[PDB]
Amino acid sequence: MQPYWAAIEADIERYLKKSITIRPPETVFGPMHHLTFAAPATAASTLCLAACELVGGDRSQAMAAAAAIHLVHAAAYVHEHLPPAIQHKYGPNVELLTGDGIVPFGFELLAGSVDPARTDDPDRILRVIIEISRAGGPEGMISGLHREEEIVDGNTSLDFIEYVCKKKYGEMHACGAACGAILGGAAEEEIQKLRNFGLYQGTLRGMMEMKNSHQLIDENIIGKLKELALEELGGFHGKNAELMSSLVA
Protein backbone atom coordinates (compact mmCIF):
# COMPACT_ATOMS: atom_id res chain seq x y z
CA MET A 1 0.00 0.00 0.00
CA GLN A 2 1.85 3.14 1.20
CA PRO A 3 5.35 1.57 1.10
CA TYR A 4 4.99 -0.52 -2.08
CA TRP A 5 3.63 2.33 -4.24
CA ALA A 6 6.28 4.68 -2.88
CA ALA A 7 9.16 2.26 -3.60
CA ILE A 8 7.95 2.03 -7.17
CA GLU A 9 8.12 5.83 -7.74
CA ALA A 10 11.52 5.96 -6.06
CA ASP A 11 12.84 3.16 -8.35
CA ILE A 12 11.50 4.99 -11.40
CA GLU A 13 13.13 8.25 -10.30
CA ARG A 14 16.39 6.43 -9.50
CA TYR A 15 16.45 4.95 -13.04
CA LEU A 16 15.83 8.38 -14.64
CA LYS A 17 18.60 10.15 -12.74
CA LYS A 18 21.08 7.43 -13.63
CA SER A 19 19.92 7.76 -17.29
CA ILE A 20 19.93 11.55 -17.57
CA THR A 21 23.39 12.80 -16.63
CA ILE A 22 23.96 16.58 -16.54
CA ARG A 23 27.11 16.85 -18.66
CA PRO A 24 28.34 19.23 -21.30
CA PRO A 25 26.63 21.07 -22.96
CA GLU A 26 24.70 21.98 -19.84
CA THR A 27 22.53 24.30 -21.92
CA VAL A 28 20.95 21.13 -23.25
CA PHE A 29 21.22 18.67 -20.34
CA GLY A 30 20.55 21.23 -17.61
CA PRO A 31 16.91 21.89 -18.72
CA MET A 32 16.46 18.21 -19.80
CA HIS A 33 17.33 17.05 -16.30
CA HIS A 34 15.36 19.82 -14.55
CA LEU A 35 12.20 19.47 -16.64
CA THR A 36 12.12 15.62 -16.43
CA PHE A 37 11.92 15.76 -12.60
CA ALA A 38 9.86 19.00 -12.30
CA ALA A 39 6.87 17.31 -13.96
CA PRO A 40 4.54 15.67 -11.54
CA ALA A 41 4.83 11.87 -11.53
CA THR A 42 2.21 10.06 -13.50
CA ALA A 43 0.50 6.98 -12.07
CA ALA A 44 0.75 5.64 -15.61
CA SER A 45 4.45 4.83 -14.98
CA THR A 46 3.67 3.27 -11.64
CA LEU A 47 0.97 1.20 -13.10
CA CYS A 48 3.48 -0.19 -15.65
CA LEU A 49 5.79 -1.60 -13.01
CA ALA A 50 2.89 -2.80 -10.92
CA ALA A 51 1.40 -4.66 -13.87
CA CYS A 52 4.72 -6.22 -14.87
CA GLU A 53 5.20 -7.70 -11.38
CA LEU A 54 1.56 -8.67 -11.11
CA VAL A 55 1.97 -11.10 -13.99
CA GLY A 56 5.23 -12.62 -12.75
CA GLY A 57 7.69 -10.32 -14.45
CA ASP A 58 10.71 -8.75 -12.81
CA ARG A 59 10.55 -4.97 -12.15
CA SER A 60 13.68 -4.39 -14.23
CA GLN A 61 11.78 -5.76 -17.28
CA ALA A 62 9.43 -2.80 -17.39
CA MET A 63 11.62 -0.02 -16.00
CA ALA A 64 12.56 1.32 -19.43
CA ALA A 65 8.87 1.52 -20.42
CA ALA A 66 7.89 3.05 -17.09
CA ALA A 67 10.51 5.69 -17.73
CA ALA A 68 9.51 6.19 -21.38
CA ILE A 69 5.94 6.77 -20.10
CA HIS A 70 6.97 9.39 -17.50
CA LEU A 71 9.03 11.15 -20.19
CA VAL A 72 6.23 11.37 -22.73
CA HIS A 73 4.07 12.66 -19.91
CA ALA A 74 6.62 15.30 -18.81
CA ALA A 75 7.12 16.58 -22.33
CA ALA A 76 3.35 16.91 -22.63
CA TYR A 77 3.19 18.71 -19.26
CA VAL A 78 5.88 21.24 -20.20
CA HIS A 79 4.19 21.99 -23.54
CA GLU A 80 0.72 22.65 -22.12
CA HIS A 81 2.37 25.11 -19.72
CA LEU A 82 3.65 27.71 -22.14
CA PRO A 83 2.44 30.68 -22.75
CA PRO A 84 4.44 32.64 -20.11
CA ALA A 85 1.54 32.31 -17.69
CA ILE A 86 3.99 32.38 -14.74
CA GLN A 87 7.74 32.43 -13.89
CA HIS A 88 9.79 29.68 -15.52
CA LYS A 89 13.44 28.89 -14.83
CA TYR A 90 13.94 28.23 -18.55
CA GLY A 91 12.47 30.35 -21.32
CA PRO A 92 9.56 29.26 -23.45
CA ASN A 93 11.93 28.34 -26.36
CA VAL A 94 14.20 25.99 -24.34
CA GLU A 95 11.13 24.42 -22.73
CA LEU A 96 9.55 23.57 -26.04
CA LEU A 97 12.81 22.13 -27.46
CA THR A 98 13.50 20.11 -24.36
CA GLY A 99 10.00 18.68 -24.66
CA ASP A 100 11.14 17.54 -28.12
CA GLY A 101 14.31 15.90 -26.64
CA ILE A 102 12.49 14.11 -23.85
CA VAL A 103 10.17 11.99 -26.02
CA PRO A 104 12.83 10.43 -28.26
CA PHE A 105 14.92 9.77 -25.17
CA GLY A 106 12.11 7.59 -23.95
CA PHE A 107 12.35 5.46 -27.12
CA GLU A 108 16.09 5.42 -26.91
CA LEU A 109 15.90 4.06 -23.41
CA LEU A 110 13.56 1.36 -24.65
CA ALA A 111 15.51 0.35 -27.81
CA GLY A 112 18.66 0.41 -25.72
CA SER A 113 17.20 -1.87 -23.05
CA VAL A 114 17.12 -4.93 -25.39
CA ASP A 115 19.33 -7.51 -23.90
CA PRO A 116 20.86 -9.51 -26.82
CA ALA A 117 21.20 -12.53 -24.51
CA ARG A 118 17.38 -12.57 -24.09
CA THR A 119 15.53 -13.91 -27.12
CA ASP A 120 12.12 -12.55 -26.18
CA ASP A 121 13.15 -8.88 -25.76
CA PRO A 122 12.82 -7.48 -29.30
CA ASP A 123 9.25 -8.60 -29.98
CA ARG A 124 8.04 -7.38 -26.53
CA ILE A 125 9.82 -4.08 -26.82
CA LEU A 126 8.68 -3.39 -30.33
CA ARG A 127 5.16 -3.88 -29.20
CA VAL A 128 5.53 -1.49 -26.26
CA ILE A 129 7.08 1.25 -28.42
CA ILE A 130 3.95 0.95 -30.54
CA GLU A 131 1.71 1.22 -27.44
CA ILE A 132 3.50 4.31 -25.92
CA SER A 133 3.75 6.16 -29.24
CA ARG A 134 0.06 5.60 -29.94
CA ALA A 135 -1.05 6.55 -26.43
CA GLY A 136 0.92 9.79 -26.54
CA GLY A 137 0.11 10.46 -30.23
CA PRO A 138 -2.77 12.36 -32.04
CA GLU A 139 -5.43 9.73 -31.23
CA GLY A 140 -4.62 9.56 -27.58
CA MET A 141 -3.07 12.03 -25.17
CA ILE A 142 -2.80 14.71 -27.79
CA SER A 143 -6.54 14.42 -28.47
CA GLY A 144 -7.19 15.23 -24.77
CA LEU A 145 -4.79 18.16 -24.55
CA HIS A 146 -6.47 19.62 -27.59
CA ARG A 147 -10.07 19.13 -26.49
CA GLU A 148 -9.26 20.28 -22.98
CA GLU A 149 -9.00 23.84 -24.27
CA GLU A 150 -12.74 23.85 -25.03
CA ILE A 151 -13.70 23.30 -21.40
CA VAL A 152 -15.37 26.37 -19.96
CA ASP A 153 -14.82 26.13 -16.21
CA GLY A 154 -18.42 26.20 -15.01
CA ASN A 155 -20.42 25.66 -18.20
CA THR A 156 -19.27 22.29 -19.61
CA SER A 157 -21.09 19.01 -19.15
CA LEU A 158 -19.71 16.14 -17.19
CA ASP A 159 -19.87 13.79 -20.28
CA PHE A 160 -17.51 15.99 -22.17
CA ILE A 161 -15.15 16.39 -19.30
CA GLU A 162 -14.92 12.64 -18.73
CA TYR A 163 -14.15 12.23 -22.41
CA VAL A 164 -11.34 14.70 -22.08
CA CYS A 165 -9.93 12.76 -19.12
CA LYS A 166 -10.26 9.38 -20.89
CA LYS A 167 -8.10 10.81 -23.70
CA LYS A 168 -5.80 12.98 -21.64
CA TYR A 169 -5.05 10.48 -18.86
CA GLY A 170 -6.95 7.25 -19.47
CA GLU A 171 -5.31 6.29 -22.75
CA MET A 172 -1.88 6.70 -21.14
CA HIS A 173 -2.72 4.68 -18.02
CA ALA A 174 -4.26 1.92 -20.17
CA CYS A 175 -0.99 1.97 -22.04
CA GLY A 176 0.99 1.85 -18.86
CA ALA A 177 -0.76 -1.23 -17.52
CA ALA A 178 -0.79 -3.07 -20.86
CA CYS A 179 2.89 -2.43 -21.53
CA GLY A 180 3.60 -3.71 -18.03
CA ALA A 181 1.64 -6.91 -18.72
CA ILE A 182 3.29 -7.34 -22.17
CA LEU A 183 6.81 -6.88 -20.86
CA GLY A 184 5.92 -9.23 -17.99
CA GLY A 185 5.12 -12.04 -20.42
CA ALA A 186 1.39 -12.09 -19.82
CA ALA A 187 -0.98 -13.75 -22.28
CA GLU A 188 -3.49 -11.69 -24.37
CA GLU A 189 -6.51 -11.98 -22.09
CA GLU A 190 -4.38 -10.74 -19.12
CA ILE A 191 -3.04 -7.81 -21.18
CA GLN A 192 -6.48 -6.84 -22.32
CA LYS A 193 -7.90 -6.89 -18.80
CA LEU A 194 -5.08 -4.83 -17.41
CA ARG A 195 -5.41 -2.37 -20.31
CA ASN A 196 -9.05 -1.89 -19.58
CA PHE A 197 -8.49 -1.47 -15.90
CA GLY A 198 -5.89 1.14 -16.69
CA LEU A 199 -8.29 2.95 -18.94
CA TYR A 200 -10.87 3.44 -16.18
CA GLN A 201 -8.26 3.99 -13.45
CA GLY A 202 -6.72 6.81 -15.50
CA THR A 203 -10.03 8.40 -16.39
CA LEU A 204 -11.10 8.42 -12.72
CA ARG A 205 -7.72 9.71 -11.75
CA GLY A 206 -7.98 12.58 -14.23
CA MET A 207 -11.48 13.27 -13.05
CA MET A 208 -10.05 14.13 -9.64
CA GLU A 209 -7.46 16.47 -11.18
CA MET A 210 -10.43 18.21 -12.78
CA LYS A 211 -12.48 18.51 -9.56
CA ASN A 212 -10.66 21.60 -8.30
CA SER A 213 -11.79 23.90 -11.11
CA HIS A 214 -15.19 22.75 -12.49
CA GLN A 215 -16.69 21.67 -9.17
CA LEU A 216 -19.61 19.59 -10.46
CA ILE A 217 -17.93 16.39 -9.21
CA ASP A 218 -20.62 13.74 -9.44
CA GLU A 219 -20.17 10.72 -7.20
CA ASN A 220 -22.10 8.64 -9.77
CA ILE A 221 -19.40 9.14 -12.43
CA ILE A 222 -16.85 8.14 -9.77
CA GLY A 223 -18.84 5.02 -8.96
CA LYS A 224 -19.49 4.06 -12.60
CA LEU A 225 -15.77 4.35 -13.35
CA LYS A 226 -14.36 2.64 -10.26
CA GLU A 227 -17.09 0.02 -10.69
CA LEU A 228 -16.16 -0.61 -14.31
CA ALA A 229 -12.50 -0.66 -13.30
CA LEU A 230 -13.03 -3.33 -10.67
CA GLU A 231 -15.30 -5.29 -13.01
CA GLU A 232 -12.23 -5.78 -15.17
CA LEU A 233 -10.11 -7.30 -12.42
CA GLY A 234 -12.17 -10.50 -12.50
CA GLY A 235 -9.49 -13.16 -12.93
CA PHE A 236 -6.63 -11.89 -10.77
CA HIS A 237 -7.54 -12.78 -7.18
CA GLY A 238 -5.17 -11.67 -4.45
CA LYS A 239 -3.56 -8.49 -3.01
CA ASN A 240 -1.71 -7.12 -6.02
CA ALA A 241 -4.67 -8.66 -7.92
CA GLU A 242 -6.92 -6.47 -5.78
CA LEU A 243 -4.40 -3.83 -4.65
CA MET A 244 -4.61 -1.96 -7.89
CA SER A 245 -8.00 -1.06 -6.43
CA SER A 246 -6.14 1.14 -3.96
CA LEU A 247 -5.72 4.30 -6.02
CA VAL A 248 -9.51 4.12 -6.33
CA ALA A 249 -9.80 5.19 -2.68
Binding site: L96, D100, P104, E108, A111, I125, R134, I142
Partner: protein, 279 residues
Protein backbone atom coordinates in the same frame (compact mmCIF):
# COMPACT_ATOMS: atom_id res chain seq x y z
CA UNK B 1 24.77 9.26 -63.24
CA UNK B 2 22.02 10.06 -65.74
CA UNK B 3 19.06 12.31 -64.92
CA UNK B 4 19.82 12.72 -61.21
CA UNK B 5 16.93 15.23 -61.20
CA UNK B 6 14.52 12.54 -62.52
CA UNK B 7 15.75 10.08 -59.90
CA UNK B 8 15.07 12.61 -57.08
CA UNK B 9 11.72 13.45 -58.63
CA UNK B 10 10.64 9.79 -58.60
CA UNK B 11 11.68 9.25 -55.01
CA UNK B 12 9.85 12.44 -53.73
CA UNK B 13 6.73 11.40 -55.66
CA UNK B 14 6.69 7.88 -54.29
CA UNK B 15 7.37 9.28 -50.83
CA UNK B 16 4.62 12.00 -51.18
CA UNK B 17 2.25 9.11 -52.00
CA UNK B 18 3.19 7.16 -48.78
CA UNK B 19 3.03 10.32 -46.59
CA UNK B 20 -0.43 11.19 -47.85
CA UNK B 21 -1.60 7.62 -47.06
CA UNK B 22 0.11 7.50 -43.68
CA UNK B 23 -1.25 10.85 -42.28
CA UNK B 24 -4.95 10.98 -43.16
CA UNK B 25 -7.46 13.65 -42.18
CA UNK B 26 -9.33 12.49 -39.04
CA UNK B 27 -10.76 13.51 -35.63
CA UNK B 28 -9.57 15.72 -33.95
CA UNK B 29 -9.59 17.44 -37.36
CA UNK B 30 -7.53 20.55 -36.54
CA UNK B 31 -4.61 18.46 -35.28
CA UNK B 32 -4.49 16.25 -38.37
CA UNK B 33 -5.20 19.08 -40.76
CA UNK B 34 -2.24 20.94 -39.17
CA UNK B 35 0.09 17.87 -39.39
CA UNK B 36 -0.83 17.46 -43.10
CA UNK B 37 -0.43 21.21 -43.80
CA UNK B 38 3.25 21.24 -43.08
CA UNK B 39 4.04 17.50 -43.90
CA UNK B 40 2.50 17.57 -47.40
CA UNK B 41 3.65 21.09 -48.42
CA UNK B 42 5.91 19.22 -50.90
CA UNK B 43 9.67 19.69 -50.91
CA UNK B 44 12.73 17.83 -52.11
CA UNK B 45 12.46 14.99 -49.66
CA UNK B 46 16.21 14.49 -49.45
CA UNK B 47 15.85 12.70 -46.14
CA UNK B 48 13.40 10.01 -47.32
CA UNK B 49 15.52 9.63 -50.47
CA UNK B 50 18.68 9.14 -48.38
CA UNK B 51 16.88 6.44 -46.43
CA UNK B 52 15.54 4.62 -49.50
CA UNK B 53 18.87 5.00 -51.41
CA UNK B 54 20.75 3.58 -48.43
CA UNK B 55 18.37 0.59 -48.28
CA UNK B 56 18.70 -0.36 -51.94
CA UNK B 57 22.41 0.37 -51.70
CA UNK B 58 22.96 -2.57 -49.31
CA UNK B 59 20.42 -4.80 -51.12
CA UNK B 60 17.07 -3.95 -49.53
CA UNK B 61 14.07 -2.79 -51.44
CA UNK B 62 12.26 0.62 -51.27
CA UNK B 63 9.17 -1.02 -49.82
CA UNK B 64 10.94 -2.04 -46.63
CA UNK B 65 12.47 1.29 -45.91
CA UNK B 66 9.40 3.32 -46.80
CA UNK B 67 7.89 3.83 -43.33
CA UNK B 68 11.18 4.86 -41.88
CA UNK B 69 11.58 7.18 -44.86
CA UNK B 70 8.30 8.90 -44.03
CA UNK B 71 9.34 8.93 -40.42
CA UNK B 72 12.42 11.09 -40.90
CA UNK B 73 10.46 13.51 -43.06
CA UNK B 74 7.83 13.75 -40.26
CA UNK B 75 10.57 14.58 -37.80
CA UNK B 76 12.06 17.13 -40.15
CA UNK B 77 8.63 18.66 -40.64
CA UNK B 78 7.83 19.11 -36.92
CA UNK B 79 11.28 20.47 -36.21
CA UNK B 80 10.49 23.16 -38.79
CA UNK B 81 6.90 23.72 -37.53
CA UNK B 82 8.44 24.30 -34.11
CA UNK B 83 11.35 26.38 -35.28
CA UNK B 84 8.89 28.92 -36.74
CA UNK B 85 6.80 29.34 -33.50
CA UNK B 86 6.61 32.86 -31.89
CA UNK B 87 8.94 31.90 -29.01
CA UNK B 88 11.40 30.55 -31.51
CA UNK B 89 12.19 32.29 -34.82
CA UNK B 90 8.70 33.76 -35.04
CA UNK B 91 8.20 33.65 -38.80
CA UNK B 92 5.01 34.24 -40.81
CA UNK B 93 6.32 32.52 -43.85
CA UNK B 94 8.25 29.44 -44.95
CA UNK B 95 8.47 28.62 -48.70
CA UNK B 96 6.34 31.65 -49.50
CA UNK B 97 3.35 30.26 -47.54
CA UNK B 98 2.05 31.05 -43.98
CA UNK B 99 3.69 29.17 -41.13
CA UNK B 100 1.77 26.48 -39.30
CA UNK B 101 0.77 28.50 -36.23
CA UNK B 102 -0.41 31.39 -38.44
CA UNK B 103 -3.08 29.24 -39.99
CA UNK B 104 -3.86 27.06 -36.96
CA UNK B 105 -2.68 28.96 -33.94
CA UNK B 106 0.20 28.39 -31.60
CA UNK B 107 -1.41 25.70 -29.51
CA UNK B 108 -2.40 23.47 -32.40
CA UNK B 109 0.98 23.89 -34.09
CA UNK B 110 2.86 22.93 -30.98
CA UNK B 111 0.65 19.88 -30.52
CA UNK B 112 0.58 18.95 -34.27
CA UNK B 113 4.35 18.90 -34.16
CA UNK B 114 4.30 16.66 -31.08
CA UNK B 115 1.96 14.37 -32.92
CA UNK B 116 4.30 14.03 -35.94
CA UNK B 117 7.16 13.20 -33.57
CA UNK B 118 5.44 10.37 -31.80
CA UNK B 119 3.60 9.11 -34.90
CA UNK B 120 7.01 8.74 -36.62
CA UNK B 121 7.88 6.03 -34.09
CA UNK B 122 4.46 4.47 -34.22
CA UNK B 123 4.56 4.27 -37.97
CA UNK B 124 8.11 2.90 -38.34
CA UNK B 125 7.40 0.36 -35.60
CA UNK B 126 4.06 -0.91 -36.69
CA UNK B 127 4.23 -0.54 -40.50
CA UNK B 128 7.74 -1.83 -41.32
CA UNK B 129 7.42 -5.23 -43.01
CA UNK B 130 10.17 -7.58 -44.11
CA UNK B 131 12.52 -7.15 -41.13
CA UNK B 132 13.01 -8.95 -37.82
CA UNK B 133 11.95 -7.15 -34.60
CA UNK B 134 15.44 -6.61 -33.26
CA UNK B 135 16.18 -4.90 -36.54
CA UNK B 136 13.22 -2.49 -36.36
CA UNK B 137 13.92 -1.81 -32.66
CA UNK B 138 17.54 -1.12 -33.36
CA UNK B 139 16.37 1.37 -36.03
CA UNK B 140 13.94 3.08 -33.57
CA UNK B 141 16.87 3.52 -31.29
CA UNK B 142 18.93 5.11 -34.05
CA UNK B 143 16.14 7.46 -34.94
CA UNK B 144 15.80 8.48 -31.28
CA UNK B 145 19.47 9.08 -30.96
CA UNK B 146 19.71 11.30 -34.04
CA UNK B 147 16.82 13.56 -33.07
CA UNK B 148 17.24 14.13 -29.30
CA UNK B 149 19.65 15.72 -26.81
CA UNK B 150 22.69 14.37 -28.73
CA UNK B 151 21.17 15.09 -32.18
CA UNK B 152 18.68 17.53 -33.71
CA UNK B 153 17.25 19.11 -30.48
CA UNK B 154 20.79 19.80 -29.15
CA UNK B 155 21.65 21.68 -32.29
CA UNK B 156 18.41 23.60 -32.00
CA UNK B 157 18.96 24.34 -28.25
CA UNK B 158 22.63 25.37 -28.58
CA UNK B 159 21.63 27.61 -31.54
CA UNK B 160 18.84 29.29 -29.49
CA UNK B 161 21.27 30.13 -26.60
CA UNK B 162 23.99 31.42 -28.97
CA UNK B 163 22.09 34.23 -30.74
CA UNK B 164 23.04 36.94 -28.26
CA UNK B 165 26.64 35.75 -28.14
CA UNK B 166 28.08 37.42 -31.25
CA UNK B 167 31.58 35.85 -30.77
CA UNK B 168 31.52 32.14 -31.65
CA UNK B 169 34.40 29.88 -32.64
CA UNK B 170 34.64 27.23 -35.35
CA UNK B 171 34.17 24.35 -32.88
CA UNK B 172 30.90 25.89 -31.82
CA UNK B 173 29.77 26.47 -35.38
CA UNK B 174 30.53 22.82 -36.36
CA UNK B 175 28.61 21.49 -33.31
CA UNK B 176 25.51 23.37 -34.31
CA UNK B 177 25.70 22.36 -37.96
CA UNK B 178 26.47 18.76 -37.20
CA UNK B 179 23.55 18.36 -34.80
CA UNK B 180 21.09 20.62 -36.56
CA UNK B 181 21.63 19.17 -40.02
CA UNK B 182 23.90 16.13 -40.08
CA UNK B 183 22.33 14.27 -37.21
CA UNK B 184 19.04 13.72 -39.03
CA UNK B 185 20.74 12.82 -42.42
CA UNK B 186 22.89 10.32 -40.54
CA UNK B 187 19.77 8.87 -39.00
CA UNK B 188 18.14 8.64 -42.41
CA UNK B 189 21.01 6.72 -43.98
CA UNK B 190 21.39 4.41 -41.04
CA UNK B 191 17.72 3.48 -40.87
CA UNK B 192 17.77 2.49 -44.58
CA UNK B 193 21.15 0.71 -44.34
CA UNK B 194 20.08 -1.29 -41.33
CA UNK B 195 16.58 -2.13 -42.67
CA UNK B 196 18.20 -3.28 -45.93
CA UNK B 197 20.35 -5.89 -44.14
CA UNK B 198 23.68 -4.11 -44.43
CA UNK B 199 26.72 -5.00 -42.38
CA UNK B 200 28.07 -3.00 -39.55
CA UNK B 201 31.02 -2.01 -41.72
CA UNK B 202 28.58 -0.75 -44.41
CA UNK B 203 26.48 1.09 -41.87
CA UNK B 204 29.61 2.78 -40.51
CA UNK B 205 30.70 3.98 -43.92
CA UNK B 206 27.25 5.41 -44.54
CA UNK B 207 27.26 7.23 -41.21
CA UNK B 208 30.43 8.99 -42.31
CA UNK B 209 28.92 9.77 -45.68
CA UNK B 210 25.90 11.48 -44.11
CA UNK B 211 28.06 13.44 -41.66
CA UNK B 212 30.27 14.60 -44.49
CA UNK B 213 27.45 15.79 -46.77
CA UNK B 214 25.44 17.34 -43.89
CA UNK B 215 28.39 19.50 -43.00
CA UNK B 216 29.16 19.98 -46.72
CA UNK B 217 25.68 21.50 -47.13
CA UNK B 218 26.31 24.18 -44.45
CA UNK B 219 29.74 25.16 -45.77
CA UNK B 220 28.47 25.55 -49.29
CA UNK B 221 25.49 27.68 -48.26
CA UNK B 222 28.00 29.96 -46.47
CA UNK B 223 30.21 30.14 -49.58
CA UNK B 224 27.25 31.12 -51.85
CA UNK B 225 25.99 33.75 -49.42
CA UNK B 226 29.30 35.63 -49.77
CA UNK B 227 29.62 35.05 -53.53
CA UNK B 228 25.93 35.80 -54.41
CA UNK B 229 26.96 36.38 -37.01
CA UNK B 230 29.50 33.65 -37.76
CA UNK B 231 30.22 31.75 -40.93
CA UNK B 232 32.98 29.53 -42.40
CA UNK B 233 34.18 32.45 -44.61
CA UNK B 234 34.40 34.77 -41.58
CA UNK B 235 36.42 32.24 -39.67
CA UNK B 236 38.68 30.70 -42.25
CA UNK B 237 38.04 32.47 -45.56
CA UNK B 238 36.31 31.57 -48.75
CA UNK B 239 39.52 29.97 -50.04
CA UNK B 240 39.65 27.54 -47.10
CA UNK B 241 35.91 27.03 -46.96
CA UNK B 242 36.03 25.88 -50.55
CA UNK B 243 39.06 23.63 -49.81
CA UNK B 244 37.10 22.16 -46.97
CA UNK B 245 34.04 21.66 -49.12
CA UNK B 246 35.96 19.69 -51.73
CA UNK B 247 37.55 17.64 -49.01
CA UNK B 248 34.18 16.95 -47.41
CA UNK B 249 32.82 15.89 -50.78
CA UNK B 250 35.78 13.65 -51.61
CA UNK B 251 35.63 11.84 -48.28
CA UNK B 252 31.90 11.32 -48.61
CA UNK B 253 32.39 9.66 -51.99
CA UNK B 254 35.38 7.61 -50.83
CA UNK B 255 32.90 5.90 -48.49
CA UNK B 256 30.85 4.51 -51.37
CA UNK B 257 33.88 3.01 -53.17
CA UNK B 258 33.36 -0.60 -52.17
CA UNK B 259 29.63 -0.72 -52.91
CA UNK B 260 28.18 -1.71 -56.30
CA UNK B 261 28.72 1.38 -58.57
CA UNK B 262 25.16 1.25 -59.90
CA UNK B 263 23.52 1.45 -56.44
CA UNK B 264 26.05 3.97 -55.25
CA UNK B 265 25.56 6.35 -58.21
CA UNK B 266 22.51 8.29 -56.89
CA UNK B 267 24.38 8.98 -53.62
CA UNK B 268 27.54 9.98 -55.35
CA UNK B 269 25.29 12.21 -57.50
CA UNK B 270 23.80 13.78 -54.36
CA UNK B 271 27.24 14.64 -52.94
CA UNK B 272 28.33 16.47 -56.12
CA UNK B 273 24.98 18.20 -56.30
CA UNK B 274 25.28 19.63 -52.81
CA UNK B 275 28.93 20.46 -53.55
CA UNK B 276 28.36 22.33 -56.88
CA UNK B 277 25.01 24.07 -56.31
CA UNK B 278 24.66 27.63 -57.63
CA UNK B 279 22.10 28.51 -54.90
Amino acid sequence: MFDFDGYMLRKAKSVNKALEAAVQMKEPLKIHESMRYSLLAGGKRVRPMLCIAACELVGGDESTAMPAACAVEMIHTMSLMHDDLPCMDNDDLRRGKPTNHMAFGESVAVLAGDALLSFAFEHVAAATKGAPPERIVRVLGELAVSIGSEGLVAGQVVDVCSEGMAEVGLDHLEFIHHHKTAALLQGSVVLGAILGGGKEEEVAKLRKFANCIGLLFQVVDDILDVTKKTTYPKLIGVEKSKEFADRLNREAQEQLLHFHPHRAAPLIALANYIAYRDN
